[PDB]
Amino acid sequence: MELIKGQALFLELDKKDFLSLKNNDKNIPTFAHPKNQEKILAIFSLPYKNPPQNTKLIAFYKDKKEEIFIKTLEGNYKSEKLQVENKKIFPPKTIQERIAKELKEANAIYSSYTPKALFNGAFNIPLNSFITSDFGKARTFNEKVASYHSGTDFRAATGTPIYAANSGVVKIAKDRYFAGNSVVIDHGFGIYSQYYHLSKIDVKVGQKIKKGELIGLSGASGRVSGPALHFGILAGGKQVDPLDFVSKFNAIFQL
Ligand SMILES: CC(=O)N[C@@H](CCNCC(=O)O)C(=O)N[C@H](C)C(=O)NO
């Protein structure tokens, strides 16, 4: 198949006599297809930066192996040039220490697989606004991708109510460098939704959260370009296009 970089894909496989799904030595977890009872699903994601040109997954059954080839497409993302580049910039050690601490914490959370659905039906947009800045907007130097927008920004004045996109469990709920006042919800199967730059947090860590229920107010914390909501989805161990993902997810899990 063909898959644009920075997107997710729902693999469909025969359930019966299935043993494992792999990508080199890396395992990929599977879950039940809710409509069809003879199928199982698995989420595969390509990174936006440095994606492999091609990927070969192998589904091992008791009676056969079954290869899946996935071609990486460049897509149609916006891209501006730079005349500056990296400089592994030199922050004060007090901040280096904080970033590294918050990075450790995030990786422990995002690599903590929950093998059951914590969601309830389809995802909803966290607020009824519109996109001010799209996912995948990139800054290039010598046609190599330096950085990119890892989520999508909605129009929101400071203090706009934000609602949970789907049911889950709260894993993060605090101020962080870069993200500002953050909230991260685990929905199960390595699917996490992210709500950054809040002015105000209304939830606690480990709290069981329901869809359409309030998680905080929008703001501009840790943000330079002013008030707005940043919404992100991490799935298959990677940041992916949220709106593209929601479309594909809802196609399957719609009630
Ligand atoms: C901690 C961090 O690096 N956050 C990045 C996105 C990556 N999230 C991964 C994570 O939080 O673990 C970020 O805050 N981008 C802001 C929202 C932006 O681009 N606004 O316009």
Ligand SMILES: [Zn+2]
């Ligand atoms: Zn953003």
